[PDB]
């Protein structure tokens, strides 16, 4: 069984050149979802807000498929995210390098699906004026591929509701609304669309 | 005997592929324990508390066994933690990357036992309201595998009492209680359990 797993990873990783990424010929769908744990900083003097969240990313590669009957009925495995291609999904309005709070390990299943869920702390541009009011304030940050268009990486969500079930119970802030919305941008010059997921969080100081 | 150790480490690390991690067929037990040194920061404006502790992890691998009689009676050795697989035990509610305060060196025994005790500084989510009262305040943070279920990594403690024997004598805070306790979570959808160790620290400003 441990022999079988070693063999599986050998066959998948050492045998082949690494996946060079998607193309318009062989595009890829990346599914994105956020789990908000807390709003950990609000800075009105510089208009910066810090979030801590889990970012779930899922995609599927034919080059990561195998037949379980051929590997002692192994149906999935975990591996360092360094061992595989991962997508270049990025926050477009960060003000500091994102900090990774969890191990970077992905789960690969025999149908070629990969799921990767890094915990992260993000600083991003947001004027928090009104957070200390009843109306609260809305912040937004877009996530999308840094170099691939919508003809190469299609971005999708499973739900437009940010998962709040793990939001810190004694947080300084109350979340009034938290959504994640697929948006498509078209430019006059060009036929290819560009895709982002818009993370929109409305919140206020708890009273 | 220096030659023998070189030969042992050669035989253990260079001969075989890396341990690919545990599976449902060949699960693994990780024993976790904390030695709390100080509460080094309490931030009521962001609800962040910082701890400094030693985190002891212990597990056992068949692939790390040897016969001392074949190696000049060597019964154990120390090696860089980078030379071996280590478990992905993670704080689930940190707010910053954990900082490592000590060398990362593991102790390996001929029965395949591994012990690794890194000093760490952790920032995590905690509303410290009540810290300056006689009642004090309770903070909690869960530790668990980021990607393995309880059918693959079983987490346990040797004791539910956090080791306070080295807690800083002139600390700003008094520890009222500190426990490290195995907890289990079940989901109806899925047969495998999920395990965490809950580090719960009740403390107050010293008067």
């Amino acid at each position: 069984s441990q022999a079988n797993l070693m063999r599986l990873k050998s066959d998948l990783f050492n045998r082949s050149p690494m996946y060079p990424g998607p193309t318009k010929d062989d595009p890829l769908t990346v599914t994105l979802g956020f789990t908000l744990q807390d709003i950990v900083k609000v800075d009105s003097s510089t208009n910066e807000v810090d979030l801590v969240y889990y970012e779930q990313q899922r995609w599927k590669l034919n080059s990561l498929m195998w037949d379980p009957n051929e590997y002692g009925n192994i149906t999935d495995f975990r591996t360092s995210a360094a061992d595989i291609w991962t997508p270049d999904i990025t926050a477009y309005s960060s003000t500091r390098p994102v900090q990774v709070l969890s191990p970077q390990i992905a789960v690969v299943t025999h149908d070629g699906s990969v799921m990767f869920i890094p915990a992260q702390r993000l600083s991003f541009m947001c004027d928090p004026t009104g957070v200390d009011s009843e109306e609260g304030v809305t912040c937004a940050v877009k996530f999308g591929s840094w170099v691939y268009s919508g003809f190469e990486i299609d971005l999708k969500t499973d739900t437009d509701q940010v998962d709040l079930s793990s939001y810190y119970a004694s947080s300084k802030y109350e979340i009034l609304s938290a959504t994640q919305t697929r948006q498509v941008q078209h430019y006059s010059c060009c036929p290819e669309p560009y895709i982002d997921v818009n993370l929109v969080v409305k919140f206020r100081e708890r009273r | 005997s220096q030659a023998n150790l070189m030969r042992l480490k050669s035989d253990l690390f260079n001969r075989s592929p890396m341990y690919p991690g545990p599976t449902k067929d060949d699960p693994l037990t990780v024993t976790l324990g904390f030695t709390l040194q100080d509460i080094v920061k309490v931030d009521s404006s962001t609800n962040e508390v910082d701890l400094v502790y030693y985190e002891q992890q212990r597990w056992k691998l068949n692939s790390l066994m040897w016969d001392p009689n074949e190696y000049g009676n060597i019964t154990d050795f120390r090696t860089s933690a980078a030379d071996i697989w280590t478990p992905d035990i993670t704080a689930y509610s940190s707010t910053r990357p954990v900082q490592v305060l000590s060398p990362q060196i593991a102790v390996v025994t001929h029965d395949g036992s591994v012990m690794f005790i890194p000093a760490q500084r952790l920032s995590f989510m905690c509303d410290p309201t009540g810290v300056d009262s006689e009642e004090g305040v309770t903070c909690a943070v869960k530790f668990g595998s980021w990607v393995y279920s309880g059918f693959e990594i079983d987490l346990k403690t040797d004791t539910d009492q956090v080791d306070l024997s080295s807690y800083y004598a002139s600390s700003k805070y008094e520890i009222l209680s500190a426990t490290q306790t195995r907890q289990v979570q079940h989901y109806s959808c899925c047969p495998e359990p999920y395990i965490d160790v809950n580090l719960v620290v009740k403390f107050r400003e010293r008067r």
């Binding site: 789990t35 969890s102 789960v107 699906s113 | 990607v147 279920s149 989901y187 495998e192």
Partner: peptide, 16 residues
């Protein structure tokens, strides 16, 4: 729920 737990989500991708 399961999908809020990263280890559970990664282990049950057909649900999460």
């Amino acid at each position: 729920g399961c999908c809020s737990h990263p280890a559970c989500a990664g282990n049950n991708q057909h649900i999460c």
